[PDB]
């Protein structure tokens, strides 16, 4: 994947289940997810087998 | 053989029953139930520690009691 | 089996003047009570604990050992090597002996409580005289602490437990009279024998159940469970100025008194060393019981057990209803000692009199 | 009445030792300069800040007993022994059970 | 000299006397006796952790009101530089044995009272010798946690032959002084006093 | 309990780098830390998540920005390398120096390897590191988990 | 004077009844299991509101000075220096201390191209102080999952436990957020 482009978590087990994101840097197989909820932005590290790339 | 030797018998086994065999099922069912038993079993789980207490004293620090990890797919 | 008598024959056979062999035998049981007794405290403290936990739906003392058991032992072994702290005053040596006049007599108590027809120390003849009197002398320890305490609100907080802990000795005292009355006896082995004669119809809490419930108050009143003597009328009040070994010794000596108090209580109206069904029946029923040991052996370790759950069974009592009957003030507690657990000790002894000089049949003749 | 102002390195106690305790005087005021092992000391440095001491116990000549002033002193104390820290002196100590830079980090002048 | 605020520069062992020194560190992380003391919510921070929903007893922390048979002081929340003497004296008058843990971003610096303000204190490592830190306005009580398992760590650095740093030197210094006395502050005379029932 | 010899100490001074495995319930690692200084180490406590980089805080000086409020202008501290400045009035026997890091779970692979080559390239300071652990005190080659 | 011994009698009998009943209560409390959780055996899940440590990129800068005067004590500091060769300026160094931080999230909200970001750490225990001007690239670093780690057990809060329930410490099913998302209601509905 590239970093700026848009994912979706698709994880039953936790609690962000199909969740939008925004990737911003790609390090040791560790993918670090943006998440735009309210006014406030949080940065959730998921893998790189949990995402799928959403166009 | 005589009947002095059986008494010295029946002390050395009630001492390594009191020592060594009991402590360990106790250390077992006591973690193995925890939550299940109710209030006079939780009264008899006490006892059975407050019981064999010198057993307890050097079963102590040798055993390990810690949660084992889990995989992840 | 006589084992006292094996060892007198073995050093006889060994060689020696009867005397010196004879000396030094006591000791080793009379330091074996002491180590047990340390051991039951270790227990109590841990079970304590863990009830409280239990009580208030949360867990005790943990990552210590197995189960946190080991932590009574590490609060022991810590508390011995803090720096020992002084106030700015003077005697001293009066500071540090009065916790040590505190802690000697209910120590010394020891050799009163059985454990069976041979396991005890000392049966001589008023065993309770050497509990009440040795235990009315802590509060000169107390009062004595106090005085070498120099402070406004220590000092007050002792006064006021020396007086909270003088008031509960004579309904102690005359509950400990209406049993010796109808047991006609001082010593504890005629008193537990005869409650082991019989079975359950035999035991003296089904004959005076006023008396009981009576020493059972003041037993609570007296090893402070439910008189939180330990806010204080500042903060605490015999508080506040010791260190880590003479509140360490305090608390050793308050769970000694526990588990005297348990012991005692259990052994003066219900009774271990007993059975619900007489051994007499089960001694006729499996064979010939009078030489051979290994049935002996098992109904020792027997009346062991049931004078151990009777001790725990009291003592869960007892630090259960410490968080079960909510907290009254020591002039309340006063009040209703005072007038409750004399009067109607008084009037339990009158019809105790009354029911054994009318029919003395059941009773003690 | 004991007055005092402590915080980590200066005592200004008003009273005076006797063997081991203080007893209330205003006649005397006994200065305790680093008592916890936070700086390593000589004989030459704490004559200066004796002396320093005296001329700020001179200074202060007229004026009530109180908290504040005393505080004072001890913080034109505290600020004295900053600037011998930093002037180019005696500092901290590796010998300590902990090391917390209370005053100030060591830096490069260049 | 180029070189500011520098740092001065300051063998076999049993393997029983070092199964001694494990035990005696042992025995004081056993038990870890804290002392409670809070003037703000931090202190309800610290009392949500004795309920039962996180058991802060399980660690062996037992709650205790005496400043004198505790080797830990827990000092949290805003302070007044009216109460830095009462901090004082309430380390000071602890067992030697003792360890600092400071909780709440007001603590350890000044907080939010740093930019305009005149009697907090910015920092109690200017009273108290903090070994363990906490930033956290307010942290969570698994941050608090979790300074309890770093102090644990902190603990069992210590030794026992160098066990001689517990201690303050004398360094007497005697000097006088020419101030003037000053009348005595008022100590109680709040109901019955003369210019309150009687008006002027 | 478990009477632990000398072991780690020659794990340390055979190799350059270590990792020890931990149970984060208390604290077991202070018995090996306090073997080292019965053995003539000095130790050092230092956390891993706030140091910055490695490169520029352990070899180089760099410059560190105060928070202020307004009322003082932007100043700049010049801070010296802390191992190198460790290293420079260290000696009362001259034996070695241990670096130790608390939290070493929040670190990535790529300055491990650069932290391994540093304590290889200058023989006299040694590299410890933490990890979260399982269930277990074992010890492990650093280098052998950067390959691996 | 019958009638107060009768009246004392009876608050006796009541007072008796009322610690029957409290023995009755605390019996009943010993049936229940415990609802605590251990740590670090068993971490809490955080939730997406719950704030943390503030996120530093150094990519999606411009150096504009506008979250400064957002944020009460100016903490994150600007390092900007003024270039002849091109036409704005640039960022130099970012530092921002988190002792005296007060954890509000009130910088992040103001942030047009969302340079600062919620980071879920809050495992912060130094011994000392001096180390919290926490730098760009050090705040460029990945979070602490708390599922990824294998030694930790994953329990969630009371809000988020599917259909309501009181204890959430079991957890059989794979079920959460109580209610429905707004996506199924588009395509049904
Ligand atoms: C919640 C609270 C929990 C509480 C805690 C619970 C957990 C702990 C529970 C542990 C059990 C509690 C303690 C048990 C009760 C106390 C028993 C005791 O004190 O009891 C005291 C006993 C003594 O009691 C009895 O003592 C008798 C002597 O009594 C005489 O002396 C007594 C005074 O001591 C009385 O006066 C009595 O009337 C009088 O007859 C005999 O010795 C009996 O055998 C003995 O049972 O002490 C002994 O056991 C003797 C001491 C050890 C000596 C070792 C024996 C000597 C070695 C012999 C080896 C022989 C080798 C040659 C072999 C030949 C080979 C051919
Ligand atoms: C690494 C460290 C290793 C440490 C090594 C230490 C090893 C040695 C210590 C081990 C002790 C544990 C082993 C148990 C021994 C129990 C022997 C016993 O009870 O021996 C019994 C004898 C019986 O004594 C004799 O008993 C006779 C028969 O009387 C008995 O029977 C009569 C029947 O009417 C009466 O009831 C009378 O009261 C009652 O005592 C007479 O009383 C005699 O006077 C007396 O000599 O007691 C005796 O001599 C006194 C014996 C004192 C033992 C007290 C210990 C407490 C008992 C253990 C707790 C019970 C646990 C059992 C666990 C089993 C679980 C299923
Ligand atoms: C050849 C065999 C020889 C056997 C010798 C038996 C000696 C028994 C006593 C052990 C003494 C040494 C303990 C060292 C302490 C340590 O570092 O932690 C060892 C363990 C760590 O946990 C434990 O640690 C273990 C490993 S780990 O550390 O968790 O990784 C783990 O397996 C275990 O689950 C856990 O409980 O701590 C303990 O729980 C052991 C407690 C031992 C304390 C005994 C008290 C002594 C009382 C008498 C005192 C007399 C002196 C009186 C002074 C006035
Ligand atoms: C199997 C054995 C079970 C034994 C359990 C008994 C131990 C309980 C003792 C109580 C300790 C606490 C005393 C505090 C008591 C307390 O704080 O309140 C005492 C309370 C005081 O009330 P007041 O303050 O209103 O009274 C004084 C004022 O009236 C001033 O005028 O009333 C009493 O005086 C009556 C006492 C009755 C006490 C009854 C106790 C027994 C209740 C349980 C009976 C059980 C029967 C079981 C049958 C199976
Ligand atoms: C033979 C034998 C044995 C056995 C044992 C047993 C069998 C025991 C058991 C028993 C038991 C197990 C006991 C215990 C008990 C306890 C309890 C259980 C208590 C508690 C309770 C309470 C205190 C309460 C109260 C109350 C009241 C009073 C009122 C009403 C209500 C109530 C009920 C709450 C052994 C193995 C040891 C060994 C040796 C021999
Ligand atoms: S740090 Fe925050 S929570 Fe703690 S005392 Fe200060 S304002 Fe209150
Ligand atoms: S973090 Fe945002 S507000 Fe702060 S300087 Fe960068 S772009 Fe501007
Ligand atoms: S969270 Fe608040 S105090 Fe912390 S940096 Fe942002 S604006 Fe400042």
């Known amino acids: 994947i590239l970093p700026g482009m848009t994912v979706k978590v698709t994880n039953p087990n936790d609690t962000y289940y199909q969740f939008q994101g925004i990737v911003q840097r790609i390090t040791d197989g560790k993918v670090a997810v943006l998440f735009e909820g309210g006014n406030w932005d949080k940065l959730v590290t998921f893998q790189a087998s949990e995402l799928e790339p959403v166009v | 053989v005589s009947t002095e030797l059986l008494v010295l018998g029946v002390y050395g086994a009630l001492a390594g029953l009191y020592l060594l065999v009991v402590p360990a099922i106790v250390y077992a069912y006591l973690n193995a139930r925890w939550y299940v038993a109710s209030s006079f079993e939780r009264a008899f789980m006490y006892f059975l520690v407050t019981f064999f207490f010198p057993g307890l004293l050097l079963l102590a620090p040798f055993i390990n009691f810690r949660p084992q990890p889990r995989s992840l797919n | 089996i006589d084992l006292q008598g094996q060892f007198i024959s073995a050093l006889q056979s060994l060689g020696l003047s009867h005397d010196l062999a004879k000396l030094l035998w006591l000791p080793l049981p009379m330091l074996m ?307 409750f657990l004399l009067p109607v000790g008084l009037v339990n002894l009158l019809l105790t009199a009354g029911l054994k000089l009318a029919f003395p049949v059941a009773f003690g003749g | 009445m004991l007055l005092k102002s402590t915080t980590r390195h200066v005592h200004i106690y008003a009273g005076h030792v006797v063997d081991g305790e203080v007893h209330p ?35 202060a000549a007229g004026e009530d007993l109180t908290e504040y002033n005393l505080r004072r002193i001890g913080s034109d104390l505290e600020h004295f022994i900053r600037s011998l820290l930093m002037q180019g002196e005696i500092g901290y100590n590796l010998n300590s059970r902990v090391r917390n830079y209370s005053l100030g980090i060591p830096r490069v002048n260049h | 000299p180029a070189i500011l605020n520098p740092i001065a520069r300051p063998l076999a062992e049993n393997i029983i006397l070092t199964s001694l020194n494990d035990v005696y560190d042992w025995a004081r992380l056993s038990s870890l006796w804290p002392l409670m003391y809070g003037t703000a919510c931090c202190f309800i921070e610290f009392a949500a952790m004795i309920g039962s929903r996180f058991d802060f007893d399980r660690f062996g922390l037992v709650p205790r009101n005496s400043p004198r048979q505790a080797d830990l002081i827990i000092t949290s929340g805003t302070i007044t530089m009216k109460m830095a003497p009462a901090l004082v004296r309430l380390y000071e008058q602890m067992p030697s044995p003792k360890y600092v843990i400071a909780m709440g971003a007001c603590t350890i610096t000044g907080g939010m009272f740093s930019s305009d303000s005149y009697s907090a204190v910015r920092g109690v490592d200017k009273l108290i010798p903090v070994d363990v830190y906490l930033p956290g306005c307010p942290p969570r009580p698994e941050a608090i946690m979790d300074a309890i398992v770093k102090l644990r760590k902190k603990i069992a650095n210590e030794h026992i032959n160098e066990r001689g740093n517990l201690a303050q030197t004398h360094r007497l210094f005697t000097a006088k002084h020419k101030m003037k006395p000053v009348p005595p502050i008022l100590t109680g005379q709040y109901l019955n006093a003369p210019s309150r029932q009687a008006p002027p | 309990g478990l009477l632990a010899g000398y072991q780690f100490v020659k794990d340390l001074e055979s190799a350059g780098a270590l990792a020890l495995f931990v149970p984060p319930e208390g604290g077991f690692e202070g018995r090996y830390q306090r073997r080292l200084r019965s053995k003539g180490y000095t130790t050092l406590p230092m956390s891993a998540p706030g140091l910055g980089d490695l490169a520029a805080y352990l070899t180089q000086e760099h410059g560190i920005r105060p928070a202020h409020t307004g009322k003082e202008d932007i100043r700049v501290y010049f801070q010296p390398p802390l191992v190198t400045y460790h290293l420079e009035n260290l000696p009362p026997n001259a034996k070695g120096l241990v670096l130790w890091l608390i939290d070493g779970k929040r670190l990535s692979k790529q300055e491990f390897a650069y932290l391994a080559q540093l304590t290889q390239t200058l023989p006299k300071f040694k590299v410890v590191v933490e990890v979260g652990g399982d269930r277990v005190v074992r010890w492990e080659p650093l280098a052998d988990w950067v390959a691996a | 004077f019958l009638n107060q011994i009768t009246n004392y009698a009876k608050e006796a009998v009541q007072s008796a009844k009322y610690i029957g009943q409290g023995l009755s209560v605390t019996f009943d409390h010993m049936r229940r299991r415990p609802i605590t959780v251990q740590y670090p055996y068993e971490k809490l899940i955080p939730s997406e509101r719950f704030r943390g440590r503030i996120h530093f990129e150094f990519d999606k800068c411009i150096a504009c000075e506008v979250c400064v005067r957002v944020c009460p004590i100016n903490l994150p500091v600007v390092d900007w220096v003024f270039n002849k060769e091109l036409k704005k300026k640039e960022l130099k160094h970012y530092s921002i201390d988190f002792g005296v931080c007060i954890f509000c999230a009130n910088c992040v909200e103001y942030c047009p191209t969302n340079c600062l970001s919620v980071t879920e750490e809050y495992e912060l225990a130094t011994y000392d102080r001096h180390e919290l001007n926490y730098d760009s690239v050090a705040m460029g670093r990945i979070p602490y999952k708390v599922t990824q780690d294998p030694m930790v057990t994953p329990i969630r809060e009371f809000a988020y436990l599917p259909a309501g329930v009181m204890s959430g410490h079991d957890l059989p099913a794979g079920a959460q957020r109580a209610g429905e998302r707004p996506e199924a209601i588009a395509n049904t509905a």
């Open chain 4, 25 to 59: 005087d205003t006649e005397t005021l006994t200065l305790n300069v680093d008592p916890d092992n936070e700086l390593e000391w000589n004989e030459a440095a704490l004559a200066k800040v004796e002396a320093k001491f005296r001329e700020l116990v001179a200074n």
């Open chain 3, 33 to 339: 009570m002491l180590i047990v007794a340390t051991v039951g405290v270790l227990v109590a403290v841990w079970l304590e604990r863990k009830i409280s936990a239990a009580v208030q739906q949360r867990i005790g003392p943990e990552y210590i050992g197995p189960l946190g058991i080991l932590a009574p032992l590490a609060d022991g072994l810590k508390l011995i090597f803090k720096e020992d702290v002084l106030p700015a005053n003077s005697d001293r040596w009066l500071f540090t002996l009065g916790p040590a006049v505190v802690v000697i007599p209910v120590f010394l108590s020891y050799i009163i409580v059985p454990f069976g027809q041979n396991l005890l120390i000392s049966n001589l003849a008023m065993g309770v005289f050497l509990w009440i009197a040795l235990s009315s002398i802590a509060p000169i320890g107390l009062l004595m602490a106090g005085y070498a305490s120099n402070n406004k609100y220590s000092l007050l907080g002792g006064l006021r437990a020396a007086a909270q802990s003088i008031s509960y000795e004579i309904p102690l005292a005359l509950a400990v009279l209406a049993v010796a009355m109808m047991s006609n006896g001082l010593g504890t082995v005629e008193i537990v024998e005869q409650q082991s004669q019989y079975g359950i119809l035999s035991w003296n809490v089904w004959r005076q159940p006023i008396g009981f419930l009576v020493f059972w108050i003041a037993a609570l009143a007296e090893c402070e469970r439910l008189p939180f003597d330990l806010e204080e009328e500042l903060v605490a009040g015999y508080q506040t100025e010791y260190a880590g070994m003479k509140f360490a010794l305090f608390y050793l000596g308050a769970y000694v008194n526990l588990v005297l108090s348990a012991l005692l209580v259990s052994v003066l109206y219900f009774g271990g060393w007993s059975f619900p069904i007489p051994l007499e029946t089960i001694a006729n029923l499996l064979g010939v019981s009078e030489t051979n040991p290994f049935l002996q052996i098992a109904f020792a370790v027997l009346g062991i057990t049931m004078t151990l759950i009777k001790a725990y069974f009291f003592v869960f009592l007892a630090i259960l209803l410490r968080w079960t009957v909510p907290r009254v003030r020591i002039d309340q507690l006063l009040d209703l000692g005072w007038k």
